[PDB]
Amino acid sequence: RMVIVGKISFCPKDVLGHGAEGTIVYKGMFDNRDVAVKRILPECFSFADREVQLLRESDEHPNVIRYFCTEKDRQFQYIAIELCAATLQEYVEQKDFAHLGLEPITLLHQTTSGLAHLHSLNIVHRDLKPHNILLSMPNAHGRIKAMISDFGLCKKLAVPGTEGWIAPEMLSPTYTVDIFSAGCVFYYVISEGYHPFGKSLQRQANILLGACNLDCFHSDKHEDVIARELIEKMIAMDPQQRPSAKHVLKHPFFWSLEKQLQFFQDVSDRIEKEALDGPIVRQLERGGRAVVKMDWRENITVPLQTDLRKFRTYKGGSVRDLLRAMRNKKHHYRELPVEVQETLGSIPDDFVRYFTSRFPHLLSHTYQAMELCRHERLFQTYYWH
Amino acid sequence: RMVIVGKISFCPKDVLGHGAEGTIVYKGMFDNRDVAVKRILPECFSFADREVQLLRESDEHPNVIRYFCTEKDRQFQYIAIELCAATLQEYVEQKDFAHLGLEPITLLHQTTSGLAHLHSLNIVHRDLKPHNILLSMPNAHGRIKAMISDFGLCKKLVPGTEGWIAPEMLSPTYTVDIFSAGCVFYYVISEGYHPFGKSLQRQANILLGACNLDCFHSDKHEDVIARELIEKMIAMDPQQRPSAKHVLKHPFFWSLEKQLQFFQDVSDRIEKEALDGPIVRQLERGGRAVVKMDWRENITVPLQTDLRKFRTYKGGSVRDLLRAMRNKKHHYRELPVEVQETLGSIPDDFVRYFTSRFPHLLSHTYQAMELCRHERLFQTYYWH
Ligand SMILES: Nc1ncnc2c1ncn2[C@@H]1O[C@H](COP(=O)(O)OP(=O)(O)O)[C@@H](O)[C@H]1O
Ligand SMILES: Nc1ncnc2c1ncn2[C@@H]1O[C@H](COP(=O)(O)OP(=O)(O)O)[C@@H](O)[C@H]1O
Ligand SMILES: *Cc1cc(-c2ccc3c(c2)OCCN3C)cc(OC)c1O
Ligand SMILES: [Mg+2]
Ligand SMILES: [Mg+2]
């Protein structure tokens, strides 16, 4: 029993799912492609054709879903969007929805990026949640991407946003409300379903209080330490403490294994031929013993320790020495004995995961102390301005 | 066993059809649309990006297909276009083809409007033919539409396809397309035949100037007009061929309502004009033949029974047959029910009532009333 008003056509029996306050979404058509069509009560939700036009007239960013065309029926409003396979909540809640085929952290880099694109054109999303981060259907080689949908519309005194993800200062807007929401979603994904506030019913309450958890992050894992450090600044109750949408992208939390290793070698070079009295070297072993674990020669594999002893030249209490030794072994890698090669290798992946596995706080620390040289030529890929 | 060449993609098993010079067409993908992919050997066919980009840069005509995007393989070229349900070939020939919601004359009209659009952008097709006029798939409310494709491509290894090639290109401008068009016109209308007219001898006889048009009776109106236009379209002198938009203004396309309206406007215009007048004189030039000696004797008994009371009606004079037309149509409401039922309902059955009996009436009037071409009333009827 089809309908037209098109432009967009559809059938009312192909219901994708109900939205907020009347708004419902069915599966319709357009050119001759399958499309998701969303009917909204003009009395409830206010489209901003202005923003969306700034989006169209601007260059396509592949992580912000596209609005095909808009139609204003006499009593309604109708919108057409890319029939995505699922929202983030599907991806997160049934691991086997068949990603297959799409990494969590890259999903987060995409989401955060599309968001950076939105914040670029001075448009704020104001309702970021897993239900508004949709995953497309398999591409040409069967890859899947992440796009932010349902951005640009709002409510007209029927508080913007959705209970559970509403930045706290918006209860009592700029980009920070979107950053906060995003932080909650990073935690939603990484932790495979939990929320930092954390159960549905007391969620918005605890947000307004300041109650977090992040109990998923052990403090003995490199990965978890970095994730925690980022999310904390993301969901900071003082909205000024919240990272810029792009600042988030630049953070360690995303870095390739190659990137991390490179960072260790680059630090090891830049702090070389630099005296101990200097600011950098002084600051770098400020935490000293703690990150190195007293003697770092003592925490590693036997072959490595054996080889190292023959040079030392190597402290064991100095982070700087662990970095110099890392850089060194990476440099002379091919001409190293087979024993060590097997204990360390491959490269960069297993080589850098070797040292961060055994010094969870190494990267975190080095990166913190090396903040001094943020403006330098080499360190631009690592830090923000 | 999928292929790639991003962003297009297709399973090679899902073939749609083979083409000229090794060119092949498959069913594949683009965004997430099903889409037809046409791979060409870049050594045989040259794509004209400039033209197509000009098509994109202009407003979309609904009977002109859309080239989505092009990509070059290292050894090939790929081109993606709207998947269509058939070619005009099928439309015409497969007995149980649902040409649903689409009369033939409106198909040729859509086609010729698309051509007007393309000529308007100074882009010439060069290979118009049944395989290059495609049928869409049922839209929102089911309606089927036709569009032209494979334009903007050419051949490098003579343009055109054997059987639809203008003669003088052998011995290019828009005239070639008008000609080939004329051919497909007859083809569609004749329900399968060709003006020239058998596959092997087609091109040959076109060179020779041999036509056919045998499906065109001289006692049925439709045939007479279709003929009237096709003949001009498939002339051997490319200077005779009417412009793509000119072909549109032609009678062949008019709804019966328009036809009847033309007879009325003509009847009105001619009234109060001297019978020696060059226009009246011209209108009656063909005379006798078209009114069938005494047009009063060539109409239903009730109508002549009712016409006998007035005349005033010469009976050998198109001016009077046309005036009776206008006058009965006007005073229709008051006319006896007998006459009402031999005639009605207006416009369709009524204008049919006259064109049926006087097949040439319309053709003839149209030709003779070309003298008032420029007048403001007669712009909907004629080409300025
Ligand atoms: N662009 C889309 N493509 C496919 N499904 C969609 C799309 N947008 C929304 N949906 C589906 O419709 C449901 C309701 O969406 P919406 O009405 O915007 O409320 P929500 O805030 O939950 O997204 C969602 O669960 C989602 O599955
Ligand atoms: N858009 C399309 N959709 C479906 N089939 C098509 C399409 N375009 C072309 N074809 C099929 O491919 C065949 C060959 O097309 P092509 O290689 O362009 O040569 P030609 O057009 O001269 O026949 C046609 O006869 C037609 O059946
Ligand atoms: C671990 C390590 C190894 C070397 C090193 C120096 C010189 C040579 C070498 C390895 O192998 C091939 C050729 N060659 C003479 C040097 C180091 O200190 C800079 C360290 O730490
Ligand atoms: Mg939504
Ligand atoms: Mg074709």
From Swiss-Prot, chain B:
Autophosphorylated following homodimerization. Autophosphorylation promotes activation of the endoribonuclease domain. Changing residue 328 to A: Abolishes endoribonuclease activity. The active site is at 127 (proton acceptor). ATP binds at residues 16-24, 38, 82-84, 129-132, 150. It is found in: Endoplasmic reticulum membrane. Residues 10-253 form the Protein kinase domain. Residues 1-384 are cytoplasmic. It comes from the Eukaryota. The record marks 313 as: Interacts with hydroxy-aryl-aldehyde inhibitors. Residues 327-328 are annotated as: Interacts with hydroxy-aryl-aldehyde inhibitors. Expressed in liver (at protein level). Ubiquitously expressed. High levels in thymus, liver and lung. In the brain, preferentially expressed in cortical, hippocampal and olfactory neurons. Changing residue 313 to A: Abolishes endoribonuclease activity. Coiled coil: none annotated. Residues 256-384 form the KEN domain. Monomer. Homodimer; disulfide-linked; homodimerization takes place in response to endoplasmic reticulum stress and promotes activation of the kinase and endoribonuclease activities. Dimer formation is driven by hydrophobic interactions within the N-terminal luminal domains and stabilized by disulfide bridges. Interacts (via the luminal region) with DNAJB9/ERdj4; interaction takes place in unstressed cells and promotes recruitment of HSPA5/BiP. Belongs to the protein kinase superfamily. Ser/Thr protein kinase family. Serine/threonine-protein kinase and endoribonuclease that acts as a key sensor for the endoplasmic reticulum unfolded protein response (UPR). In unstressed cells, the endoplasmic reticulum luminal domain is maintained in its inactive monomeric state by binding to the endoplasmic reticulum chaperone HSPA5/BiP. Accumulation of misfolded protein in the endoplasmic reticulum causes release of HSPA5/BiP, allowing the luminal domain to homodimerize, promoting autophosphorylation of the kinase domain and subsequent activation of the endoribonuclease activity. This is Serine/threonine-protein kinase/endoribonuclease IRE1. It comes from Mus musculus. The gene is Ern1. The chain holds residues 562 to 963 of 977 of the full protein.
